[PDB]
């Protein structure tokens, strides 16, 4: 090799640090460094690494710990929000699975569910809040059948702090588990059944599930989440929020909708009751519109659940170098400095005004108050719906905006909230207040340079050369650089260089 890549989107804070990658090879090598910008989607750079430089792709770019965790592996697990569902009597729920593809990739399927109490009388409807699943999946090593060892915690949480329903009552010991599957997909019929017991004051349940028809035709992840959620735990001051386990012993009626992207559907339709001392989860699952030679009916997906992965970020950034490496042969060099999280900004007058501290503070106080937020944050699903989730915000007028503008609008006072990145310059000049996101909706985006084991191999010395960057931009030091450019105008290339020369990088 002779050049390397370096990609950047068409973002400030993406052209100036791409700018400084490229000035520190070319300061510290004898590689021709090419600057190729990507037009488009928030996973183009992602897209373009993953072709190389050798097919006008790129070879390095700056990626952040949290987007790669949360958005492309969809590592933990993710929090399942549960929200009352009045026309059912029940809930609803919708969130996102992703499962791991032999060759690399991630194959991503949509749930849809509805639940609906078997009973006639009062359940509990909950206050929005979340289920967290960690899912153990092994194989029992004596086993002949197809089948699956399943352990699962599950925990209730997202609300800060009779006592409990009659149906609670029900849970209080080691419960047995009968879990019974009949399907169909594309016409392969098939038969699950699972054994088990759940422990509700742990959150614990442990199942063992065979496929009694011969071999599954599809991959057993793909059935964990069709395969109890009255067995969470319901912290005490939450027990209020607990519908699945007041609609026992009679029961409830579980369905969903699972869409696998570019693939077939999942529908399902399940019982879940007491029968005696037993609870059972009955389900009908039929799959249509299947690719017999994709991911799913040709068993291509690996035969896990995401790992727990510890979640403070030296955890975070050791479980996405350690997956982008074993996946994709990409690694992950040191961070930079700078957490460019999520953040919503009010005026710094305006905010002390009602005493503004955090996200909760601002949707206590979110009716008086309009969001101009950027657009591919409202659509967004994993965006600004699951942040309305959580928090529960009544900005009953937001707008759809476009770049900056709302900015000028904040400052018009067309608009009191707006959405922005910690790393912005202009919140510093426009007087603005950045809130904390107290329950932490936003995972952490400490940005890093990523570069291909491809180029690596070639060339191992662009190991050291770009991690003389390792904590050389703090926060502050980003946001007075993006707002040279977005502020003053100032080329970004000779921001970025000027930057370095001023540390004595080159």
């Known amino acids: 090799n002779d050049t390397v890549v370096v ?3 068409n973002h400030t804070e993406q052209i100036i640090v791409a700018n400084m990658l490229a000035e520190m ?3 510290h090598t004898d590689l021709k460094v090419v600057r190729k910008l990507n037009l488009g989607g928030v996973n183009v750079n992602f897209e373009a690494i993953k072709r190389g ?8 770019y700056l990626e952040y710990v949290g987007y790669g965790l949360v958005d492309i592996l969809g590592y933990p697990e993710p929090n399942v929000y549960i929200i009352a569902d009045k026309q059912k009597n029940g809930i609803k729920a919708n969130f996102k699975i992703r499962y791991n593809v ?10 849809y569910q509805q639940n609906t109490p078997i009973g006639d009388g009062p359940v509990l409807l ?6 967290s699943t960690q899912s153990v999946l092994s194989k029992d090593p004596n086993e002949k059948r197809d089948h699956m060892v399943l352990l699962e915690f599950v925990t209730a949480a997202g609300i800060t702090l009779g006592s409990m329903s009659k149906g609670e009552e029900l849970f209080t010991g080691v419960v047995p588990i009968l879990v019974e599957l009949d399907g169909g997909v ?3 019929k098939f038969s699950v059944r699972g054994e088990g017991e759940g422990d509700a004051t742990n959150g614990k349940l442990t199942l063992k599930f065979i496929c009694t028809t011969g071999k599954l035709p599809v991959p057993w992840p793909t059935l964990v989440t069709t395969l109890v959620q009255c067995f969470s735990r319901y912290p005490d001051h939450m027990k209020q929020h607990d519908f699945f386990k007041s609609a026992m012993p009679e029961g409830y009626v579980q369905e969903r909708t699972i869409s696998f992207k570019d693939d077939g559907t999942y529908k399902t339709r399940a019982e879940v009751k007491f029968e005696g001392d037993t609870l059972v989860n009955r389900i009908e699952l039929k799959g249509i519109d299947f690719k017999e030679d994709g991911n799913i009916l040709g068993h291509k997906l690996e035969y896990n659940f995401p790992p727990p992965g510890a979640t403070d970020p030296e955890g975070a950034y050791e479980t996405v170098k350690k997956e982008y490496k074993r996946k994709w042969n990409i690694v992950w060099l040191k961070p930079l400095g700078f957490n460019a999280s999520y953040v919503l900004a009010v005026k710094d007058e305006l905010a002390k005004q009602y005493n503004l501290k955090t996200f909760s503070d601002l949707a206590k106080i979110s009716d008086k108050l309009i969001l101009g937020a950027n657009m591919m944050f409202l659509e967004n699903p994993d965006g600004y719906p699951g942040l309305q989730k959580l928090y529960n915000f009544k900005f009953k007028h937001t707008k759809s905006m476009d770049a900056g503008i709302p900015y000028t609008a904040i400052d018009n006072n067309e608009v009191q909230v707006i959405d922005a990145t910690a790393t912005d310059g202009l919140l510093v000049s426009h007087k603005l207040k950045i809130l904390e996101d107290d329950k932490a909706f936003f995972p952490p985006y400490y940005a890093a340079p990523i570069i291909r084991q491809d180029v690596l191999d070639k060339h191992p010395e662009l190991k050291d050369v770009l991690n003389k960057l390792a904590n050389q931009i703090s926060l502050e030091e980003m946001q007075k650089l993006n707002y040279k450019r977005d502020g003053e105008g100032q080329d970004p290339a000779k921001v970025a260089k000027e930057f370095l020369k001023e540390k004595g990088l080159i």
Do not use: K, R, T
């Open 126 to 131: 909950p206050d929005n809040h979340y289920l």
């Open 7 to 9: 990609g950047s989107i």
């Open 102 to 111: 032999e060759d690399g990739s991630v194959q991503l399927a949509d749930h």
């Open 53 to 60: 430089g050798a097919n006008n792709g790129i070879d390095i």
């Open 186 to 188: 594309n016409g392969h």
């Open 25 to 27: 090879i070319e300061a």
